[PDB]
Every structure is written in C-alpha cells, then in structure tokens.
Amino acid sequence: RAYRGGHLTIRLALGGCTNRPFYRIVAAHSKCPRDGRFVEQLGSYDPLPNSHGEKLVALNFDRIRHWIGCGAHLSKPVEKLLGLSGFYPLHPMMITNAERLRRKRAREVLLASQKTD
Amino acid sequence: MARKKVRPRLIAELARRVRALREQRERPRDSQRYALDYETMMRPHSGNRLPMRAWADVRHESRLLQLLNRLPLFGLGRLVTRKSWLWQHDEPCYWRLTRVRPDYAAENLDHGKAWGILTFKGKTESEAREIEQVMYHDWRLVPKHEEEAFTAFTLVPEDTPLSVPYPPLLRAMILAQRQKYGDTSTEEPMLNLERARIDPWDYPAKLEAKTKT
Amino acid sequence: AFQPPPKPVIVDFLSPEFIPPRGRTNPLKFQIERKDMLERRKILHIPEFYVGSILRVTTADPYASAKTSQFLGICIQRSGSGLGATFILRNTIEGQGVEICFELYNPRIQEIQVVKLEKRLDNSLLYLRDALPEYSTFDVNMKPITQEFNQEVPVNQLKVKMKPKPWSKRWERPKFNIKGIRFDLCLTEEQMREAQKWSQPWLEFDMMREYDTSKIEAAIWDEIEASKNS
Amino acid sequence: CLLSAAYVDSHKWEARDKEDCHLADLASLMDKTYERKLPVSSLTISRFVDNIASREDIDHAEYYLYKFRHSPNCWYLRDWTIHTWIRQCLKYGAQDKALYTLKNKVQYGIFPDNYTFNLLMDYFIKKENYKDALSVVFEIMMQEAFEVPSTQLLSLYVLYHCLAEKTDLSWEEERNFGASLLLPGLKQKNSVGLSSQLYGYALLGKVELQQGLRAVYCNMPLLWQPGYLHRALQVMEKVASSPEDGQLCGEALDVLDRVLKAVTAPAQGTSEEQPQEGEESQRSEELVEQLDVEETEQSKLPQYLERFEALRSKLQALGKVESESLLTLSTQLAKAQLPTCEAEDIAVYEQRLQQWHGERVRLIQREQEQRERARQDYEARRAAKASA
Ligand SMILES: [Mg+2]
Ligand SMILES: [Mg+2]
Ligand SMILES: [Mg+2]
Structure with missing residues (x-):
C-alpha cells in the first residue's frame, strides 16, 4: 500500500505456531505490519532448540550485505544475531547483559554462602 | 487510477486552498507558541509537559533571548555558550552571533531566531548556520574580559586507530575469496575508519533546507 | 519588556430629538423635557451618530446568563421628539434579520458605542428589509473605527441591490425620494414612468409647509451650553 | 565633570x-x-x-517609546536618535526620566554605547546626584561599553560612594558593588585599577562563600568559575612585576573576608543561622554545580589565610605603596588624565556627528525617492488602468 514515508528495515517477522515461535529474517518496509508485505526474504530463526540441542539461524549474507549497502536499517535482535554469527561485531547490549548476569551469579553465590552457616 | 467516469471533485481542492490560507493568516507566533508556565511545566500553546530531567534548568537558568535582550546590538559578534556544553565538554564550545531577529510580538521580548558561526570542541566551521534550540533554558553569556580567555583551546591530535580488525566471519570470507583466486599473500586485512567519523549527540544540526546537487 | 516607540507626529451638531414638533404644544413642556434629557445625558453618554452608522448597545436583561446584553447593528432610522426618541437597529444573525427599536433615554441601556460613524444617501433606509442580506449582515465582534474630525463624517455613496418584486413598500414612488437603490437593474422604463404619476412637484415650492427652526435651535443650543456650564 | 566645560x-x-x-x-x-500592522x-x-x-512632549515620546x-x-534603531532623545531629556528633566529609562535597561x-555615558555623568555631577548617579554605573557595567575613556570617570564616582558606604551590605549589594569594579575598572597604568580589581574580587568572593556560586553570574556579567579569591590573590602576586599598588582598601576588605571566614568555622549557630x-x-x-574532587573553596580557607598573610607582609616590605586614602589618590589621578582624554574624544565625537548627519539625509532621500516612484506608478496605472 501507499505510504507517506518509511525506511527499509531488515527485521524478524514472527510467523509461527502457538508456544512455538519461528522468525523469518526478512527485509520489509518500516510502516508495514510485522506479517505483512515484504521485499525479499533472507533467512530463518528457530528460538527453541531441536533434538540435538542446536538453535538454527539462517542468514543469506550475500543479500544482507547488498541491502545494508542499499540502506536497510537493522533491528536490535538482528544485530545480536549477526554479532553471534560473526558477520558483525558483538552488540554492547549483549556484553552489558553478560556482565549483569555475572554480577547476579556472584550475588547469588554470596547469598547462598551466607545462608548456609 | 484513470477512468472515463471520474468525477471532477472541487471541494477537496478548495479545502487545500482554505487550509493553506488559514495556515499563514492564523500562524501561531513563536512567542505564545513557546510560552511556558513555570509552575506546572505545561506549555499553554501545545499542551505538552516538559521532561522531568529538565525541571531544574528551567528554574535555575536562562534562555538565549532572555540574556540577549539587554545587549546594545542584540549581540553582534558576541559569544554564547550552554550549561550542557560547559558540563559535558571541557573544551570550549561557543556560538558567535552574526545576526538576530527577535520576535516583535513578545511583550517581554524574550523570543526570536538567531544565526551565527558554530565552534564546537574548538573546531571552527567556515559556514553560517542557524542557531538551534534557542528556547532552551541553558544558554550563558561570557564577559568581554573573558572573551579572549575562553577561546584559548589547544589542538591535540586524536589517538583513534585508523584501521580495525575485521569480524572473524567476514575475515574468513575475505581470506577464502582471495585464496580461491589464488592470492598467497597472508597479509592481515583491516577495515578503514577514515570516513567512519561521526558527530556527538550534543552537536547541533542545521535548520536550513537541503539543496539537491 | 522593551518599550515600543510609535507615531512621530511630524507634520503641520444638534441631535434630532431636541427639535420640537410642528404642533402648537406649549414651550414649557419642551423646556422641561429638554432639562430632563440633559440630566439623563449627564450620566449616560449619548454619542453622535446618523442614519446608516453602526452601533453597539448594552441593555440590562435580567433573564440572560449575564445581566448585560449586547446588540450590534446599523441604525435604520431615528424618530421621536424629546425624551421619547427611538432608533432602529438591524442586523442579520444566522440568516434571520432582527430589528430592535431602542429608546435613547431608556434607563436600561448601559452603553451606546458607535463602531462606524458614517452617513448614507438616504435619511431613512427602511428598504434594508427588501434589500439583499449582504447589506444587512454585520459582524457582531467587529472593532470600533476611529476617524479624524476633519473628515466631516464622510457619506457612504453605495448603491444597494434589491430583491425581486413585491417589496415591503413602494420604494419607487417619489414620496420616498430614495437615491441609494440601484433602480436601473431592478425596474424597467415603463415602471419608472408609471411611478412618476404620484409625483407632487408643488410640494417642493409650496413655501408654507416648511419648518423653520433657526431661533428654536439657537435657544436650545444656548440652554445646552448653560446646562453644560452648570 | 570637567569634560563638559x-x-x-x-x-x-x-x-x-x-x-x-x-x-x-x-x-x-x-x-x-x-x-x-506595518513596520x-x-x-x-x-x-x-x-x-x-516640552516635558509633555517628552511623556508623549515615552508612550511612543512604549507602543x-x-x-x-526593532533592530534598525539609529544611534543618533538615542543622542537626540538624551539631549531632549536633559533639556527638561536631566535627572528623573533618563534614570527611569535606564534602570530597567531592557x-x-x-x-x-557612546560618549553619552560620560556626558550624562558629567551633567549629573553638576547637582552631584549622590543617589541618582549610583544606579547608572550598574547599567553601564551591564551594557559593557568600557571602550571610550570612561573608566576613570566611573571609578571616581564609585570611590566617592564607597567611602560613604558604612552599612551592612545585603545579598544584592555584595553582588552589585563587587561587580561594579572589575568590568568598569580596568586601568593598568595607575594603581587605581589594580586596587579596584582587588576590592571587587574580595566582595564578589563573599557571595560565593556565603550564599552560592550561581548567584554571582545569574544576572551579573561575571564568570562561573569558582576561583575568585585566587583572582584576588593573583593581582597581589603580580607585585613582582608591578611596583605600584593600592595596598590599603584591598587589604582592609581582605581582613573583613578573613575574619568572616574565621568566625563561621567555630560558631555554626551564630553567623550561619541566617537561613x-x-x-x-x-x-x-x-x-x-561543583564536582566531588573540584577542590571546593570551603576547604581551602587555611590556604587562603596563609597566602594573604604572606603576601601582605611582602607588599609592605618591598612595595611600600601604602597610601593615606584611595579616594584622594584617585581624585588627583582621574582628573589629571581627563584633559588627555578630552582631546582624544573630541575628534571621534566630531566625526560621529558628521556621519550621523550624513546618514540622516541618505534616509530622507530614500524615503523621497520611494514616494516619488510610488506616485509615478500610481499615475501611470491610473492613466491606463489595465488589470487582469
Ligand atoms: Mg496463531
Ligand atoms: Mg512532544
Ligand atoms: Mg406590507
């Protein structure tokens, strides 16, 4: 449909089943709905692990770099997945969340030690 | 799209002219547009409430036009700074005012639009830019006896590296791409940052229309 | 709070009600009525206004939301002698023309304000009922217009369009003597010739039906000056 | 006042x-x-x-000033109009309306920002205008027009008033009297300017020490840096190169500053109980406003006292510029240089009046040509009315 503006965004369309998420890493307009019209599909993301304990993420790097060069914006989960894959540097939000998790583990260990004596 | 039975609508076109005329004839003047109620922090014109973090500076500081009104020629060649710049940036950041048009509708004469030259972090721009955020209650003026002292800035070269290592996956991609063609050079690839320089969020932007070249 | 410097300066009527009627009423009644109307004018400021001017009148209305009621309109006519003088104000509000006949010396009037002092080509414009609504429509919230004394109350020479026949009165008859109506676009030559059969040319030269009031006006002006000096 | 002669x-x-x-x-x-609504x-x-x-015309011109x-x-106000209005005010009132229109100053x-600043003070001194001329110095300092030789003229009057000042200064007084000597007084040729700077810094530091830092630059054209006692001490330290100083009024005011800072520390409910x-x-x-490690002036009192005590001994030991009174020394110095500055200001005033008169006729000619071209256009259109 016609839009007054908007920008191309490579995001995740949550297309799946109840209690079973499944994201399609797709490049679409910013003003379109999440499961609406899109430009070109790039990859897939499975949040839940499979029988092998592996989380499958699909990236079409050739199209991803082309669209990013054309001027496609990226979402925070998209940047996180790209940093995990290694095509992009690790997002500092992941680093600060890891630091917070480490501090929480240290606090939990201290509380467990002080609740035992 | 284009049909044989298209009705030549005229009311819709006349409404565009009516709204265009009412936009200019009833244009809200910037004085009452930016008028502020200092008790409830509510704008009488727009009806939006100011941020909680901005409640202190509104009551404890002054805006640009509230201090520029007492100057003889509305600050021709004067240097004006900001509280936020003074706090965050130790390097001098000032605006040299070249022209000011205060709004005549204000009874207290504390609103207007000014242009000038921006010198942020000691870097002097050779172009004239319209002053942004005039209504902000953070502007401060420097005296004449300190005008020369505040401009004292030292040019220290930056220590930012010009090249950075590639991410591991892209580095492997490049290594495989050149290896397939047969380049036996095992030189470390680097990503350039010469054109990656970006301005800080405190750096004001220009308010003039962009010219398409 | 800058001071704004404007203009450099660099460059170098008897009201109709005071006229007594032509009857043989004793002058003592006229003198008493003039004294009473001057006493009333001492409190209520009655400005100078002619037929065709636009006025705003404030009246004491007990049944309104506020005790003051404002009505703005053009003065259709002024008639009466002494304390009972009245003037008719006409204004079209939301397509419905309203005419109100106010009394000059009624105590319920709070303020009379002339927003446009302007004469017209006719001493009594009763034809606004049959005229187009555009000539009777006036903004209630218009601002008063101040004019210089040297303008000598300029007269508005405006030709007024007319609705198709019939009209409220026979405005084409010579007895009305109306010049402000654009008759050439509303009436035909045969109708114009027919209307001339009621003309009475001898009345302009009768020399006896005229009313001379030079001495009466002089005495009234002297009494007004004495009352003002009092 | 000798200038107007x-x-x-x-x-x-x-x-x-x-x-x-x-x-x-x-x-x-x-x-x-x-x-x-036409400009x-x-x-x-x-x-x-x-x-x-007449003064009725002056009041008309004031209600004018105001509509x-x-x-x-607004910005196109000519300079010579200010001079003409000031001269007309001097013609009748000379004392009330000029002060009322300047005290607000906004x-x-x-x-x-011309020689009118000196001229008004010279006319004021004729009646000597003790309380009338005090406010004008504050507004001149706010305007910051200390380019013409008015520094000595204003320094004479502020030192006239300082001797008469025997009271307990309030919050506004400790700010304005202190600020009325740094920006106005800047003469390096005589000891009067250095003494005025030392006196002003000492009074300006009291507001920062007692009330807060923001109040000294909220409205006064001063600096937000916390160092003002250090600025008071640096001019005294400059004695190694400057041989001539005041050494009397600055020392007396620094004695008051040190006793005020020494009585508040042991007694907290005596002087600090005013809030x-x-x-x-x-x-x-x-x-x-300050940081945690910005070296707050409250903890530097022992440093300030030692610096002042060490500097005042050396100033008397080597400088020995202790005068009997600063006012009598400034009176004979300010009036000595007045004949020197009148001869340098007369030529610039004579050329300013010529250029203002040249601009007046240029504006008159602009208006005349605009009117004549408007008349020509109206007559040409009336001769051959061609619209649409
Ligand atoms: Mg479902
Ligand atoms: Mg908003
Ligand atoms: Mg009838």
Missing part, C-alpha cells in the same frame, strides 16, 4: 535640529500604519525627538 553642548546641539515638525498628519499616519523606520522617531518642545519598537523594524533599552526560610523546598531543588 570644554565639551560645550549648547553650541553644537542647536546645529543638529533640521526637522521643523508638528503634530497632526504624521500622528494620524503612523497610528494608521500600526492599525494596519516603519527610525527616521520618523528621530524626527520627532528632534522637535521636542512601536515591538514592530519588525524595558527602554536606549543602549547609548531559616525553608528546608524541604531547598533540599528538593538543591543544585550541585
């Missing part, structure tokens, strides 16, 4: 009025322009103030 104004002022004006038509015309020139407002006849410059042509905003307005209102709106 050789700067006779009645001879040249009566040679500037060439407008020969009256009331009615231009009164009406400009009231019509502002009924129509106008300063040429007309100069023309009328050129033909003021146009809120038009688009409400009327004449902004006379009884509110507690929760101040705690909720408390502002922290």
Whole structure:
C-alpha cells in the first residue's frame, strides 16, 4: 500500500505456531505490519532448540550485505544475531547483559554462602 | 487510477486552498507558541509537559533571548555558550552571533531566531548556520574580559586507530575469496575508519533546507 | 519588556430629538423635557451618530446568563421628539434579520458605542428589509473605527441591490425620494414612468409647509451650553 | 565633570535640529500604519525627538517609546536618535526620566554605547546626584561599553560612594558593588585599577562563600568559575612585576573576608543561622554545580589565610605603596588624565556627528525617492488602468 514515508528495515517477522515461535529474517518496509508485505526474504530463526540441542539461524549474507549497502536499517535482535554469527561485531547490549548476569551469579553465590552457616 | 467516469471533485481542492490560507493568516507566533508556565511545566500553546530531567534548568537558568535582550546590538559578534556544553565538554564550545531577529510580538521580548558561526570542541566551521534550540533554558553569556580567555583551546591530535580488525566471519570470507583466486599473500586485512567519523549527540544540526546537487 | 516607540507626529451638531414638533404644544413642556434629557445625558453618554452608522448597545436583561446584553447593528432610522426618541437597529444573525427599536433615554441601556460613524444617501433606509442580506449582515465582534474630525463624517455613496418584486413598500414612488437603490437593474422604463404619476412637484415650492427652526435651535443650543456650564 | 566645560553642548546641539515638525498628519499616519500592522523606520522617531518642545512632549515620546519598537523594524534603531532623545531629556528633566529609562535597561533599552555615558555623568555631577548617579554605573557595567575613556570617570564616582558606604551590605549589594569594579575598572597604568580589581574580587568572593556560586553570574556579567579569591590573590602576586599598588582598601576588605571566614568555622549557630526560610523546598531543588574532587573553596580557607598573610607582609616590605586614602589618590589621578582624554574624544565625537548627519539625509532621500516612484506608478496605472 501507499505510504507517506518509511525506511527499509531488515527485521524478524514472527510467523509461527502457538508456544512455538519461528522468525523469518526478512527485509520489509518500516510502516508495514510485522506479517505483512515484504521485499525479499533472507533467512530463518528457530528460538527453541531441536533434538540435538542446536538453535538454527539462517542468514543469506550475500543479500544482507547488498541491502545494508542499499540502506536497510537493522533491528536490535538482528544485530545480536549477526554479532553471534560473526558477520558483525558483538552488540554492547549483549556484553552489558553478560556482565549483569555475572554480577547476579556472584550475588547469588554470596547469598547462598551466607545462608548456609 | 484513470477512468472515463471520474468525477471532477472541487471541494477537496478548495479545502487545500482554505487550509493553506488559514495556515499563514492564523500562524501561531513563536512567542505564545513557546510560552511556558513555570509552575506546572505545561506549555499553554501545545499542551505538552516538559521532561522531568529538565525541571531544574528551567528554574535555575536562562534562555538565549532572555540574556540577549539587554545587549546594545542584540549581540553582534558576541559569544554564547550552554550549561550542557560547559558540563559535558571541557573544551570550549561557543556560538558567535552574526545576526538576530527577535520576535516583535513578545511583550517581554524574550523570543526570536538567531544565526551565527558554530565552534564546537574548538573546531571552527567556515559556514553560517542557524542557531538551534534557542528556547532552551541553558544558554550563558561570557564577559568581554573573558572573551579572549575562553577561546584559548589547544589542538591535540586524536589517538583513534585508523584501521580495525575485521569480524572473524567476514575475515574468513575475505581470506577464502582471495585464496580461491589464488592470492598467497597472508597479509592481515583491516577495515578503514577514515570516513567512519561521526558527530556527538550534543552537536547541533542545521535548520536550513537541503539543496539537491 | 522593551518599550515600543510609535507615531512621530511630524507634520503641520444638534441631535434630532431636541427639535420640537410642528404642533402648537406649549414651550414649557419642551423646556422641561429638554432639562430632563440633559440630566439623563449627564450620566449616560449619548454619542453622535446618523442614519446608516453602526452601533453597539448594552441593555440590562435580567433573564440572560449575564445581566448585560449586547446588540450590534446599523441604525435604520431615528424618530421621536424629546425624551421619547427611538432608533432602529438591524442586523442579520444566522440568516434571520432582527430589528430592535431602542429608546435613547431608556434607563436600561448601559452603553451606546458607535463602531462606524458614517452617513448614507438616504435619511431613512427602511428598504434594508427588501434589500439583499449582504447589506444587512454585520459582524457582531467587529472593532470600533476611529476617524479624524476633519473628515466631516464622510457619506457612504453605495448603491444597494434589491430583491425581486413585491417589496415591503413602494420604494419607487417619489414620496420616498430614495437615491441609494440601484433602480436601473431592478425596474424597467415603463415602471419608472408609471411611478412618476404620484409625483407632487408643488410640494417642493409650496413655501408654507416648511419648518423653520433657526431661533428654536439657537435657544436650545444656548440652554445646552448653560446646562453644560452648570 | 570637567569634560563638559570644554565639551560645550549648547553650541553644537542647536546645529543638529533640521526637522521643523508638528503634530497632526504624521500622528494620524503612523497610528494608521500600526492599525494596519506595518513596520516603519527610525527616521520618523528621530524626527520627532528632534522637535521636542516640552516635558509633555517628552511623556508623549515615552508612550511612543512604549507602543512601536515591538514592530519588525526593532533592530534598525539609529544611534543618533538615542543622542537626540538624551539631549531632549536633559533639556527638561536631566535627572528623573533618563534614570527611569535606564534602570530597567531592557524595558527602554536606549543602549547609548557612546560618549553619552560620560556626558550624562558629567551633567549629573553638576547637582552631584549622590543617589541618582549610583544606579547608572550598574547599567553601564551591564551594557559593557568600557571602550571610550570612561573608566576613570566611573571609578571616581564609585570611590566617592564607597567611602560613604558604612552599612551592612545585603545579598544584592555584595553582588552589585563587587561587580561594579572589575568590568568598569580596568586601568593598568595607575594603581587605581589594580586596587579596584582587588576590592571587587574580595566582595564578589563573599557571595560565593556565603550564599552560592550561581548567584554571582545569574544576572551579573561575571564568570562561573569558582576561583575568585585566587583572582584576588593573583593581582597581589603580580607585585613582582608591578611596583605600584593600592595596598590599603584591598587589604582592609581582605581582613573583613578573613575574619568572616574565621568566625563561621567555630560558631555554626551564630553567623550561619541566617537561613531559616525553608528546608524541604531547598533540599528538593538543591543544585550541585561543583564536582566531588573540584577542590571546593570551603576547604581551602587555611590556604587562603596563609597566602594573604604572606603576601601582605611582602607588599609592605618591598612595595611600600601604602597610601593615606584611595579616594584622594584617585581624585588627583582621574582628573589629571581627563584633559588627555578630552582631546582624544573630541575628534571621534566630531566625526560621529558628521556621519550621523550624513546618514540622516541618505534616509530622507530614500524615503523621497520611494514616494516619488510610488506616485509615478500610481499615475501611470491610473492613466491606463489595465488589470487582469
Ligand atoms: Mg496463531
Ligand atoms: Mg512532544
Ligand atoms: Mg406590507
């Protein structure tokens, strides 16, 4: 449909089943709905692990770099997945969340030690 | 799209002219547009409430036009700074005012639009830019006896590296791409940052229309 | 709070009600009525206004939301002698023309304000009922217009369009003597010739039906000056 | 006041009025322009103030002052119009309206950054205007027009008033009297300027030490840096190169500063118990301007006292510029240089009046040519009315 503006965004369309998420890493307009019209599909993301304990993420790097060069914006989960894959540097939000998790583990260990004596 | 039975609508076109005329004839003047109620922090014109973090500076500081009104020629060649710049940036950041048009509708004469030259972090721009955020209650003026002292800035070269290592996956991609063609050079690839320089969020932007070249 | 410097300066009527009627009423009644109307004018400021001017009148209305009621309109006519003088104000509000006949010396009037002092080509414009609504429509919230004394109350020479026949009165008859109506676009030559059969040319030269009031006006002006000096 | 003796104004002022004006038509015309909301020139407002006849005309010119410059042509106010208006005010009142229009300094905003600043003070001294001329120095300091040789002229009067000042200064007084010596007083040739700077810094530091840092630059044209006692000490330290100082009034005021800072430390309920307005209102709106390791001046009192005691001994040991009184020393110095500055200001005033007169006729010619071309266009269109 016609839009007054908007920008191309490579995001995740949550297309799946109840209690079973499944994201399609797709490049679409910013003003379109999440499961609406899109430009070109790039990859897939499975949040839940499979029988092998592996989380499958699909990236079409050739199209991803082309669209990013054309001027496609990226979402925070998209940047996180790209940093995990290694095509992009690790997002500092992941680093600060890891630091917070480490501090929480240290606090939990201290509380467990002080609740035992 | 284009049909044989298209009705030549005229009311819709006349409404565009009516709204265009009412936009200019009833244009809200910037004085009452930016008028502020200092008790409830509510704008009488727009009806939006100011941020909680901005409640202190509104009551404890002054805006640009509230201090520029007492100057003889509305600050021709004067240097004006900001509280936020003074706090965050130790390097001098000032605006040299070249022209000011205060709004005549204000009874207290504390609103207007000014242009000038921006010198942020000691870097002097050779172009004239319209002053942004005039209504902000953070502007401060420097005296004449300190005008020369505040401009004292030292040019220290930056220590930012010009090249950075590639991410591991892209580095492997490049290594495989050149290896397939047969380049036996095992030189470390680097990503350039010469054109990656970006301005800080405190750096004001220009308010003039962009010219398409 | 800058001071704004404007203009450099660099460059170098008897009201109709005071006229007594032509009857043989004793002058003592006229003198008493003039004294009473001057006493009333001492409190209520009655400005100078002619037929065709636009006025705003404030009246004491007990049944309104506020005790003051404002009505703005053009003065259709002024008639009466002494304390009972009245003037008719006409204004079209939301397509419905309203005419109100106010009394000059009624105590319920709070303020009379002339927003446009302007004469017209006719001493009594009763034809606004049959005229187009555009000539009777006036903004209630218009601002008063101040004019210089040297303008000598300029007269508005405006030709007024007319609705198709019939009209409220026979405005084409010579007895009305109306010049402000654009008759050439509303009436035909045969109708114009027919209307001339009621003309009475001898009345302009009768020399006896005229009313001379030079001495009466002089005495009234002297009494007004004495009352003002009092 | 000696300037006006050789700067006779009645001879040249009566040679500037060439407008020969009256009331009615231009009164009406400009009231019509502002009924129509149309900006106008300063040429007309100069023309009328050129033909003021009485104080009633001055009050008319004031209500004038108060109903146009809120038009688009606010910045185009000419300089010579200010001089003409000041001269007309001096013709009648000379003492009340000029002070009322300047004390606000933003409400009327004449902004006379010319020799008129010296001329008004010279006329004030004729009646000696003790309380009348005190406020004018504050507004001149705010305007920061200390380019013409008015420094000594204002320093004479502020030192006249400082000797008479025997009271307990309030919050506003400790700010304005302290600020009325740094920006105004900047003479490096004599000891008067250095003594004025030392006196002003000492008084300005009291506000920072007692009330807060923001109040010294909230409205005064001062600096927000916390170092003002250090600025008071650096001018004394400059004695290694400057042989001539005041060494009397600055020392006396620093004695007051040190005793005030020495009595508050042991006795907290004696001098510091003057803040009884509110507690929760101040705690909720408390502002922290300094950092934690910014070396707050409150903990540097032992450093300040030792520096002052060490410097004052050396100043008397080597400098020995201890004068009997600063006012009598400044009186003979300021009046000595007045004949030197009158000869340098007469030529610039004589060229300023010539250039202002040249601009007046240029503006008159612009108006005349605009009117004549408008008449020509109207006549050409009326001869051959061709519209649409
Ligand atoms: Mg479902
Ligand atoms: Mg908003
Ligand atoms: Mg009838």
